[PDB]
From a paper:
The human glycosylase OGG1 extrudes and excises the oxidized DNA base 8-oxoguanine (8-oxoG) to initiate base excision repair and plays important roles in many pathological conditions such as cancer, inflammation, and neurodegenerative diseases. Human OGG1 contains an AlkA_N-like domain and a helix-hairpin-helix (HhH-GPD) motif55. Here we report cryo-EM structures of human OGG1 bound to a 35-bp long DNA containing an 8-oxoG within an unmethylated Cp-8-oxoG dinucleotide as well as to a nucleosome with an 8-oxoG at super-helical location (SHL)-5. The most predominant oxidative damage to DNA is the oxidation of guanine (G) into 7,8-dihydro-8-oxoguanine (8-oxoG).
Because only 147 bp DNA is tightly wrapped around the histone core, there is 10-bp free DNA at both entry and exit sites of the nucleosome. OGG1 prefers to bind at these sites over the internal SHL-5 and +6 sites, therefore, we decided to perform a focused 3D classification in the OGG1-bound DNA entry region and derived an EM map at 3.2 Å average resolution. In this map, the nucleosome region including the DNA is resolved at high resolution, but the OGG1 is only at a low resolution of 5–7 Å. We found that the OGG1-bound DNA region at the nucleosomal entry site is bent, as compared with a free nucleosome structure in which DNA protrudes straightly outward. Consistent with sharp DNA bending, we find the undamaged base G closest to the OGG1 catalytic site has been flipped out to an extrahelical region. However, it has been unclear if OGG1 extrudes a normal G in the absence of a trapping crosslinker. Our above-described OGG1–nucleosome structure revealing a flipped normal G at the nucleosome entry site was determined in the absence of a specific crosslinker. However, the nonspecific protein-DNA crosslinker formaldehyde was used to stabilize the OGG1–nucleosome complexes. The observed OGG1 preference for the nucleosome entry/exit sites is likely a result of the enzyme getting stuck at these DNA ends. The DNA entry/exit sites of an in vitro reconstituted single nucleosome resemble double-strand DNA breaks (DSB). We suggest that OGG1’s preference for these sites may endow the enzyme to function by marking the DSB sites in vivo.
Author numbering:
A (entry chain K): 12 to 79, 83 to 325
B (entry chain D), C (entry chain H): 27 to 121
D (entry chain C), E (entry chain G): 9 to 118
F (entry chain B): 18 to 101
G (entry chain F): 18 to 102
H (entry chain A): 37 to 134
I (entry chain E): 38 to 134
The structure:
Amino acid sequence: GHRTLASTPALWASIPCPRSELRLDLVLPSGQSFRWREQSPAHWSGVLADQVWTLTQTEEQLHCTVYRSQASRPTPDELEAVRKYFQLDVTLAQLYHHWGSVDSHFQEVAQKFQGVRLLRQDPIECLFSFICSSNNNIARITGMVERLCQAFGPRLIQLDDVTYHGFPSLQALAGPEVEAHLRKLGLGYRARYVSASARAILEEQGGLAWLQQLRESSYEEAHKALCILPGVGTQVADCICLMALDKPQAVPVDVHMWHIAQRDYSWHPTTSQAKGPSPQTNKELGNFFRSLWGPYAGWAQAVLFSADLRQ
Amino acid sequence: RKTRKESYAIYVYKVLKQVHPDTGISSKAMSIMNSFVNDVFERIAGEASRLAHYNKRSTITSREIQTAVRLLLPGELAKHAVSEGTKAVTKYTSA
Amino acid sequence: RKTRKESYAIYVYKVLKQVHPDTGISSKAMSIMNSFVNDVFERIAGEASRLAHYNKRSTITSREIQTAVRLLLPGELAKHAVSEGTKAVTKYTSA
Amino acid sequence: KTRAKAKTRSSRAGLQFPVGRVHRLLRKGNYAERVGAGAPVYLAAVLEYLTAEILELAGNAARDNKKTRIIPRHLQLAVRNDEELNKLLGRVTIAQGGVLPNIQSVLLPK
Amino acid sequence: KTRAKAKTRSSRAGLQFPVGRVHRLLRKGNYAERVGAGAPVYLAAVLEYLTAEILELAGNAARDNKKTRIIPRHLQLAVRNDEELNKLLGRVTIAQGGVLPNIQSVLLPK
Amino acid sequence: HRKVLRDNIQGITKPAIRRLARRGGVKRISGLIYEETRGVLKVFLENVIRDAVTYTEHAKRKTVTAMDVVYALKRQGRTLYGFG
Amino acid sequence: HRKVLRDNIQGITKPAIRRLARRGGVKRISGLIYEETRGVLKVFLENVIRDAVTYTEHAKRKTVTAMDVVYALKRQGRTLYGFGG
Amino acid sequence: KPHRYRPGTVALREIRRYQKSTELLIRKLPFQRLVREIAQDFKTDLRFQSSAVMALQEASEAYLVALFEDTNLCAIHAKRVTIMPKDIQLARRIRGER
Amino acid sequence: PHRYRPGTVALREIRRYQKSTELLIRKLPFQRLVREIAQDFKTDLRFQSSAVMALQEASEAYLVALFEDTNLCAIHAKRVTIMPKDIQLARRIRGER
DNA sequence: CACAGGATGTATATATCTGACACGTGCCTGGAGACTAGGGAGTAATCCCCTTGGCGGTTAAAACGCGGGGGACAGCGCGTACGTGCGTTTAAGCGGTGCTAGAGCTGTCTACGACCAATTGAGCGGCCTCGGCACCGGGATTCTCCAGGGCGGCCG
DNA sequence: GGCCGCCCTGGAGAATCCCGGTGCCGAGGCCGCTCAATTGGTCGTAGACAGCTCTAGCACCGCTTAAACGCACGTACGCGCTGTCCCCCGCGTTTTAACCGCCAAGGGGATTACTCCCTAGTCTCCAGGCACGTGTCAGATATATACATCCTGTGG
């Protein structure tokens, strides 16, 4: 079972993370990841880098524990990796103050919201998690990702309810018959969007090296390269750039964001001649958000999305 | 010398000769005719007994037989049977 | 004052009280049960009469009733009815 | 004792079927306590008419088959081809009678 | 006069249905010339058993329907839910009894 | 006091036949069923009532009792319980 | 001689059932018809023979006469002509 | 947008309601008039007990319900859910009424 | 070779066996079947020849009538081949099951 | 796809048994004559109950209409299953014999059931009377159905 | 720029179930009382039982051959799928006639006497039909065709 605060006192790792700068219950279940589940209050658990990380939030520190195999005191490299994953080097207090100064609506929203941060996931893991994240509820996508990990991931241990496995390897997803096998699992048409987004990585784009080289590439070139892959629309490409390529300028735009804009910001497509989901409307909304907030508008977009879900 | 078994052989033969003067009957056809006559007799007699019991009478008369015939025989068969029975009863009472 | 009519109401009620002491009956249900008893009586009596006529007997005895019950009631109903009838006849003769 | 000449009750009614035999059968069939005088006459007349009708139809059927003797097949044909007799004998099986020639229109070739 | 105490034939055989009434009905029903002594007892026992069985099933149905009086619907349920009773009463229509709940599987939504 | 009735077969309305079919367990009914059904009903009565009238003629009565209908149904093998 | 007969239902051969169907007007017969027909025939014969043997036992006889079969058929509403009266 | 049930669910509800009930389905007066009209052809100036008409109505309803059950079985046999006059004719012919 | 088409011989057999009147089931197998069935009810039974003939006549008539009903049921379903479901439907409607 | 010819049943003609049916005969048992008696049923008079007929208010149910969605019906393809024909094998069919279990009739007589006079109590009918059931009101639960959900590629 | 691919929750709305008070009328119990069930005999015959006869059923055998059985080949057909279109269901609105209660009249169903004639019951007598022989001719069998029918290639 998942470790509780009174289970293993000597199997914890504490990092400086104040409550104001981060809210675990407002980020992980807000659709930013589909591999974390809640069993006990203020607890989350997900498999990254073939190791199961369980996270809890205290008043001013963040506690983490690791499942692999029978060792404690996780090495500092894991702490550095999780700090990069959580962007602990970036302070959101200044961004919140600037956003409140430029617009009072964010401050009104952030009156009770303080600590909706962003993640830095593995590009392969984030891409394959968000491939099947189109036109579905968060729970359905999370279950889909869990079933995919069970089917194509190396198992680690059964945590008294369900086995935990590492993320499926890229070689096992580029093979034939994968589409039908995943449709048997119940992925729908998105299963095909997985296959066309796997083989082309190794057979048409240049393998993992091409994908990893985009972490230091330009914004537009990386966005276009991600959009080249089948099934990768503008929204998922922006999400991957923001949460897997370290691109704060990427602002996801969707139905929740559009509803927020039309109900609180009263923004309308000026150049565009319609109000439906289109790349031109997405680009206009992104430009408007960047002009109104700045280069780090993705964090404010995530704050609004988390606020929209909890309302 | 055994127990004599009665049947309607002679009467069916006489009726056949009256209808078709130059036509015979096989033994199997005669047995079928015997069974048919016995079955119709049983049906009419049972219906007459039911009619007598329902009306709290203790006798079976021509009226009961006529009602039983009208109940059992369908269509023009009932009409012709009633006509034949009425003619026979009138002739019997006259002589 | 009128002519009194007989029915199986009291006996059906006694049997019902023996089976289900805390259950009642309706007038329509009592009439239906009376019709059922009359129908079964008529069936068994007619079958026994046919059996007596076929075997050239002139008396309906418990043997004819048992044969009629076997011919009419299907399955375990016949077995249990025969058992009950045999028990009743044995008790009647003993006392 | 020379009484009057005995005349059968069938002769009095002009019938061929035995009035006395039917009277005895009614009296011995436990149908009722009493049997009227005209009840045997009526029953004999009805039986004679039914036998005459069925025999006429059977003889016509046999003549149509170029035979001069009624077999069970002719009786079956006579009963089934006549509507009223068929209704009367709907639940009756005639031994060695066969069935009417009847092939459904769907099964025939076209 | 002082005879022995009158003991009914129903009590002698341990039955509830009337032996004397069944004896009279057989005697006056014109079923046979003579009626035996044990035939009314046997017939009464058979009728009592059948009534007891059908009433037990009807009372069970009434209890399952949360009622303390047996109505025609309960009798219909009892008769049609038992194979032997249904076979015995196959061509019997019970007044105000309705029909068993039975919807074919093809018609149900899927 | 002379009253002659005519065209009363239409008194068995379409909803009545639909209710009977639903009691029987029918989900969809064709539009041509109803007329057909009416005819069937008539034929049924044209048998049973006829037999009943015959019994009424034998008793020298001018009214049709319930027992007459019960006997008429018993002739056709349709024993009815609940009317005597 | 005490002999026991078993598995005689197969004596109702496929051609016999085929001829019976042909008399009824059947043009094509499925292969599974034969077993169902054998079952139906066995049920019918069991029903008739039970009544016939009941009649025979009532008469204290050990021979099943034709009139017993006729009475058994008459009980089931299948009156048969040509075997007595 | 008005709330409309899909075709079929109301039919199943009616089936359940009517099979749960025991009351007569045909109206009393039309059936009584039909009975009197039919009886006129057999004997003029007839009279009926109320119980006689009730018995006729119950017998007719039972017969029609059984016929409709057989018709439904025939319709299902033909891979259909709608009963048609051919189904009634087939059921009657199998039962021997025609 | 002069093979007839699939079904003309069937119609010829229909005509031949509807014109004829003889028993269609062999007598000895039917007699053995009757004796086997009767063994279950009472041991050491004897049968008259007329009894077995009457049983065979009744059996053949019942089977022919059931086959006519089955043929009607099969034609109702727009088919010319009889199947066990047709027999089941016919017996259900007739009231035998 | 219409048609003439080849091949296969099929009905028609004719001789030739043969055994099943139609006719003649003896007799005996079941039907007819004649007479009596007693009860079942036909007929008249009466009570009164149940049916028929009329009427008006209420409103539940039937009739009409419209939209549409689901089912009926026709067409098409295909692949297994069943018809058809031929060679083998099986055991049904026929007649012949032999034995005997059991159906079938007969004679005794005994116990069982019909019938009758005398009682008498069980059960039918009439009358309370109260409790089970029909019903209404209101709320909770359940069942059905459609719109919208961090969308995307496409043919208009 | 709608739009459907695939489908999966979440409400909205309607139907149904549950709980409790109301009230009402019919099921159940009681009570007198009349007729049918029970007692106690008596007598007549129905059938149970023993015995004998002789019929038909059962068993076996040989041996002819019709029929069943197995197998191979081909094609008619059942079955699944798709598309169209039409008609039956669901729902709302308007009409109508069923239903309920009331009243009154009288038709005839049911009960009771009274009588009479019609059928069961006996005895006697005789002839109609049943069992038994027996002859002969209608039908079954076999052979020999003349024609109807089915199936297929060649020809256009």
